[model samples]
Target chain A: GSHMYLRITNIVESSFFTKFIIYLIVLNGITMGLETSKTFMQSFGVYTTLFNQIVITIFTIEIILRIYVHRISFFKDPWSLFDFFVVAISLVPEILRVLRVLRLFRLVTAVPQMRKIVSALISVIPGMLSVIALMTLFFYIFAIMATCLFGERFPEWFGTLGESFYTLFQVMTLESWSMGIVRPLMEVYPYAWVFFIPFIFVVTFVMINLVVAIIVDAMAILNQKEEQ
Target chain B: GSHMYLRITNIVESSFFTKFIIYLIVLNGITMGLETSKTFMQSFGVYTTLFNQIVITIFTIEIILRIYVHRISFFKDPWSLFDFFVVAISLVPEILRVLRVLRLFRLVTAVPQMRKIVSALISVIPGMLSVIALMTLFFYIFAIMATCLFGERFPEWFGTLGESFYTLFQVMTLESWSMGIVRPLMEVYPYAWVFFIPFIFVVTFVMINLVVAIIVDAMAILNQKEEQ
Candidate 1:
């Protein structure tokens, strides 16, 4: 039993096996993309369906072999868990067929540079949580203020507290904030710039700067580790 | 003459002088803001005009005093240059009335924290220049590709190289990318996501992350300086 498991591990860890999986993933992505087209699906739906089942079968067996060789430690590796998750999702009913596209993300695990980027992002997430919290609070406070200040005049944008929140969010994204919302509001309340300008500075400038600062700090640590 | 020059220097550097300029800036901001309103202008047009002239006169004297106190060293200080620039712009004809709003930026120099933020941004610009160049190159290459691939089918968006560039930029902003553009294109070209998904990941995610990283690096240096 131990010898057989060792042989499976050797096969799984081989360069050929990794290349085979990558090709399979690319093939799966193409088929899934083609499925989005109605004419192609109508012409070759059955063939694609059979191909999908075959691909899933191979994926399932590959994952089972990996788990068997690794045993309890199989779940310890995030990439392994990710692979397991994607394969498992493939087995569920066709209602979630679109989700199979997530298999493409498996490429991130396969590619060395992509894996580094993902890990760096994961490391910075905890530090980003507080900044996210502060932004939400900032948005909420401004929404309330906006609703009070311009609710009567500009009901379309600031009629309700929720509407005010949404509009303020749209403003923060700088999506038509000038011509779409603020300029119109300014006609009624010339001082609207006073509120919106500070809002822009704090949310877009200050908050974004803070987030970038955290990411830079995380990447510096990442670089330091690689150097050592 | 030496005693008079010293007395003028003392006046320019005083806390009260700083507070007086701050108050004038705030007042000028309101008057400029009020000028945006037709009703306000009709009601207090002459009064605001007189008030603006008075404000500009004081601003000019303030800049002159600072230059006298600092002599050639006045230009050595960026804030002094900023003050001189703003006052100079205020002297220009009302044809560029809107530009006068830039005076509000002077508040940044007056406030310590805002001054630090602006300086940090200035320090980061040299480092960010390369990243900006790379992004422009990325955008150009993709725009050419998009124009070739989708120009015939989606002429409205990708007919010309410039149109493709604009569409790609709009997509990067995630404004209405999915519903407004991509979904409709996908109806004809199912693999449109193949092009756009990577474009999005590279532009919005990768480029933005790089920018944040650069900003973080700059801020870290800024913090190190203040600490030392």
Candidate 2:
């Protein structure tokens, strides 16, 4: 029984099988695209539905073959677990009718570089969370100060704590911030540039750059460790 | 003849006047901000105008003094030239009244860190241009492809080649892009995710990171060169 399972898993892992599965993924892509049109869906709904079932069947069989071959160790690989979850979630009958969307997550597994990027991203989470915390603290201080400083004059943009955050976030991106928001504010509080400019410099230039710096520093440490 | 010139140069370069001018720059900042307001200017036009004249006189005198002190070296030193250009451009007579913001550029001269940042920024321009050129190339390819692939139905966002480029630029910033743009488009073309998702990943995740990496690498090389 184990030998039979091994044969199935070997075939699934072969280059030919991988190419075949990628082709099916592209076919699955076409079916979803075709379903986009009302006319196409009305005429071809049955065919699309049948094609999707075949795609789902292949994914299911692949996961099952892996489990039978590897047994207890199959789920040890996070990618395998991810593949199982994405395929499993799409199988819930009511959701399956509309929710092949999650199956798109499979692309991370399909492409090698995509997987590496995701893994690098995952590794940076701890440092990233610290940056997020720092940003929130900075945002809170400014949010309160902005409400106090510009609140009465420009209530629409700085009316409340939340609104202050939204405007400040817009400022962080340097997106239409100068002409759209600050220029108008300058007309009101001629010295308001002092408020907005530093907010951009500190939060964006200093704080966010620090976040990227932390990521770079962490990556460097990781590299040094690998070299040794 | 040069002895009298040296006397005037020493007084201008003295700590007393430098401190006094630092005070004057703050004064200049207020006048500009005050001019931004219709009510403030209407009420205080005479005082603001008078105050600006004092600023222009002080800046004009500083440049004259520096040229006397350093002679030909005044223009040879880039920082001196930068200081000269900033002050001299403002004193161009006609524009000085409306050139209040240019006065703010003087603050860059007065602050040490600001000078460092500006110099660092200028140093990286050559390398930065290559990345920007690379970005422009990447953008052109995507914009052309996007205009072709999605332009018909979503003419508002991708109607013309120009519009597609704008939408793609917005996507690079990761700003409400999924909800604001992609969600709407997904309803029209279900598997548009195959295009849009990877498009975002490449430009934002891959391309921008390359830009940041180039900057970090150049900065490191710069530091090493400086240390030696």
Candidate 3:
């Protein structure tokens, strides 16, 4: 009976009906990725065109199968009905290319799992929000100070809050934050290291760690939930 | 006495505390915006420094008041304590400038409200994630394709997936997406609108809209909740 129950569930979940839908998603994901690369277009122009046509043909057949599968009760599942409407809407040739990207929406099929993870992580939201808010505030205060102190020396770098923000946002990513914002500040006020040190601690060290901690905690809960 | 009770009740539900916190937030936001404009700095150098001193002074006073108002039991109110900590930590002259940025944490005090908005916007997250995932997959496929087609036509642009992602990120931001990626592709393909149309649609239009829609929905929901 247990075996029979498992079999029944698998059939419902991965029936010929569902398998085709999965195939379409996989194909779409690949084609979308492929078309975005310049090198890919030049090398695999013929192959991409062929694959695209194949995917389109399969999509057309899938639509037919879906309509047949649904028959009179097609409207029962609103989502299924939505899928039908979107698919039908994209069939027009002029709109087809424009709407091809719309197929990306099929990823919504993965939402139940995503939601589970998000809800699990919700407890950490406050910590995360506080850290982010604090970091944003830090960036703003630094920008203001930088404008006042380094504005004359490094006009482009500390000219205004907007430039400071753009530079700071780059910094938060940990890529060019120092070169873009700090180095220039140092050039202008080399002894300002006294000023820079604590700012760096609060902005880079403390806040980044706070953010990472929240994420790690959420991940831990997610992992525990998954194990269960 | 009845009116006092009503006032306290209104304060809690109206999140008067949260709104009060937002005043600090508004001050920070105004400061950040002011910092962005270069003219403000040049024209009001003296005034800017004075303003900075005043704001910091007010914040210092606020912290002292907060400590007294909330009492030694301040830690019981984590948010209030956080505000206290940020202000106190920032007072250390060595790091005062940097710690000042922590004032932005006042924005997080608004999170109970933000969480409501986030939940309402949750549905869009999966959709946006899927679009992002699909875009990532496309990016890889294109990277491989670029290596195959042009070989070294624009080596800088079509170099690798990391480079491709960087180009794509810039493109999505509308800063250098087209100039970096599309223009190079056009130089290579010249007349290949077949590849160009779908690529632009997927990366620039559809995917962009999906992400933007998710954010817009979240913001709208947040605002609606605030009104309620």
Candidate 4:
């Protein structure tokens, strides 16, 4: 019985099992895709349901095999913990009864590349705090400035401090900014470009470059530590 | 003649002159600011116009002094060239009349910090080329796939290849992505989440990591070169 447990561990650890799971994920991905189409769901409701059951069953088996092999060490790894939550959410009845379609994010969670990138994101968090603080203050100062300066006529976008904050945030994203907010503000205040254009350059260019420099420098420090 | 020329060069490059320009730019920034308010313009039109002439005249004198000191070599440094354009744009006629406020950017051009950051940006160009190629292909393939897959019911966002590409680019920017696009698409095609939620991870996480990695590495190489 102990020998069988070890064998199961060996199998899960093997490259074949990993590849199998990856492919199963892909197949499961297709089924998930098909579920989007109303026609496909209506026409192949039975088949799609059957396919979904099979994939879930396979995932359950993989997890069980993983626990059988790793035992205590399985929980030691954070990734296994991530997988546990994913499987738990998928299998749990009460919570799963709602948000059925929301499970596609679970599939996203399983992707190894996403996992690595996520950790890299985690690594940058500490370094991000100061810049984030600066940005918060930066936004606050500018939001009030905008409300004070542009509040009277273009009240829709900068009616109050809160609205100006939202509009300024939108401008930072540079999305339809000129058309949506700035152009209209210009019609009311002819010299608004003086404030808006340089604001764009400062926030969009300098601010972005500064943040990028901080994140890059942080990641580089992390890499150096790893190498050492 | 040589002594006089050297004396003029020293004056243009002096701390007093540089600070003078900085203060002038700030005053220029304010005049530009006042021009935006209709009430201010109605009350102080002559005053604003007079201030504009004074700033322009001083800038011209400053430029003349720089040229008198440095001669043709004055145009060699990019910053000098930028200042030249700043003064030229404001002094010029037809092209200058279209948007007076845009000249504030010309004021911003005087900031040495921006010039340095801009060059650091330029240094990354060659390295960014590969990722550009990758992103171009990535978007092209996904846009076509989206056109083939989701083009039917939701033609507005994903109607054709071109439209899909545009929406996908917007998705990459994470602008109103969840509220504007994904949630609605999720309602129409229940499985659209399977396609979209995971794709967001691919481009947002893995794709950004790749681009950031490239930029970071490129900057490191530049730093090493500087050290040597």
- List model 2 lDDT by residue over B1-228, tens digit each: 478887887798788987787788888888788888999988999998898887878888888877878889888887778777777767666455565466677677777788899987787666555445445655655665566567788988886668888999887876656546765776787666566666764565455455555556565665556556
Candidate 3 lDDT at B184 equals: 60
Evaluate candidate 3 and give its CAPRI docking class based on DockQ.
incorrect
Candidate 3 lDDT, B1-228, residue by residue in tens: 366556554544465654655775686667646655667657866765676667667777656545544456666876666766766775565335644655665565456654443333334446456666877788778667655554466555456654454434444334434453566677768854464456666776764465456445544644564455
How would the candidate models be sorted by lDDT, starting from the highest? 1, 2, 4, 3
lDDT of 4 at B179: 76
lDDT of 4 by residue, A14-105 (tens): 88887777777777678878887999988998898887778778878988888877788889977787677676667765646444444445
Q: What is candidate 3's lDDT per residue for A1-228, written digit by digit as tens?
A: 367556554544456756666677777778878888999888887887777667667667765655554565757865566566666665665655667666656555434564466555666676566456555666766777666566667777666666666655664554443333554455556555455545543464444345435544555555556556
Per-residue lDDT of candidate 4, residues B78-122 (tens digit): 667877776777776532543344444443355565445556655
The list of candidate 4 runs beyond 4 A from truth reads A1-155, A158-166, A173-208, A215-228, B1-7, B64-76, B92-99, B105-126, B140-166, B186-195, B210-228
The digit string of per-residue lDDT tens for model 2 on A1-228 reads: 567776887887788876777677666765665555557779989998898888999899878877877777767888878888878876777324444554655655665655765575456446556667978899899999988989898886798997687667657756567777889889878998998888877776665565577557655854564456
TM-score of each: 0.52, 0.50, 0.42, 0.50
Q: Is candidate 1 or 2 superior in lDDT?
A: 1
Candidate 2 wrongly placed segments (more than 4 Å): A1-4, A37-46, A70-76, A93-99, A147-156, A159-161, A186-191, A211-228, B1-155, B158-169, B173-205, B212-228
User: Whole-model Cα lDDT per candidate?
Assistant: 0.78, 0.71, 0.58, 0.70
- Rank order (by DockQ, best first): 3, 1, 4, 2
